[PDB]
Design a binder for this molecule. Structure first.
Ligand SMILES: [Ca+2]
Ligand SMILES: [Ca+2]
Ligand code: NA
Ligand SMILES: [Zn+2]
Ligand SMILES: [Zn+2]
Ligand SMILES: [Zn+2]
Length: 259
């Protein structure tokens, strides 16, 4: 008798791309062989948007751990990309293209995930709560859920080393040696970990930690969800490499039980 156990997969062949997603070979600044690039290819729309949909549905009956290497654009919070949305949903890549994800005020309904927010959108009440308005590289991370009507809301919390919870961090810098600590314009690991026993999804990035319960995210233990890596950018605000959000899927790892 045969039962599907955990798998660990790596590489872009396990994802289908949607919208503004393309390949960049041997990017000189990132020092790896290939990245998947968001917000470069045109899609005939002012709002560039793109998604990588994992071809396997993710079973929440079992643990998973995603280690996703991402690099952020070296660009102002008012010029660059909206950010990264790591998204779980019954919807698919085509629905995301039409309704959005978790990086703005509204998105695909009944979905949830973790966002690295790198852009200031005056229409998003979350960007105002986080004092995102600025001209540098200050962004924030948080788990996010959309309701039945599509509205995004914060879920869970930062787990600070000391003091008060804080979502903010610098998503890029003008460091002056980029070897050692966190420099968000380089490839850095985002760990997305889920423990089916505790019901907790944990995100680790930029030396910070966030947690949310799947009950508060609106995900059910017994369901299986599509997993999407997304980014978007509003054009016309900037310019070479403008808005580029890149991930190295060849050295990213995804451990899960497919379903
Ligand atoms: Ca939907
Ligand atoms: Ca934002
Ligand atoms: Na790098
Ligand atoms: Zn493979
Ligand atoms: Zn720059
Ligand atoms: Zn709602």
């Amino acid at each position: 008798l045969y039962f599907q156990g955990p798998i660990t997969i790596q590489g872009k062949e396990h994802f289908e791309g949607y919208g503004s997603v393309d390949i960049q070979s041997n990017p000189e600044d990132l020092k790896v062989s290939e990245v998947t690039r968001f917000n470069n290819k045109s899609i005939g729309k002012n709002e560039l948007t793109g998604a990588l949909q994992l071809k396997n549905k993710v079973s929440f009956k079992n643990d998973f751990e995603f280690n996703i290497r991402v690099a952020n654009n070296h660009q102002s919070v008012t010029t660059g990309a909206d950010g990264w949305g790591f998204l779980f949903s019954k919807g698919d890549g085509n629905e995301y293209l039409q309704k959005g994800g978790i990086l703005g005020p509204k998105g695909m309904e009944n979905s949830a995930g973790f966002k690295i927010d790198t852009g200031y959108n005056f229409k998003d009440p979350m960007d105002k709560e986080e004092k995102q308005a600025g001209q540098g590289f200050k962004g924030y991370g948080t788990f996010v859920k959309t309701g039945a009507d599509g509205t995004t809301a914060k879920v869970g919390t930062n787990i600070p080393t000391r003091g008060k919870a804080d979502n903010s961090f610098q998503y890029a810098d003008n460091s002056d040696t980029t070897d050692g600590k966190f420099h968000g314009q380089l490839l850095n690991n985002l760990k997305l970990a889920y423990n089916e026993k505790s019901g907790i999804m944990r995100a680790e990035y930029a030396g910070k930690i966030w947690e949310a319960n799947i009950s508060d995210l609106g995900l059910d233990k017994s369901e299986a969800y599509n997993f999407l890596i997304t980014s978007s950018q509003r054009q016309g605000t900037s310019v070479y490499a403008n808005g580029w959000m890149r991930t190295d899927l060849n050295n990213s790892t995804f451990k899960l039980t497919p379903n």
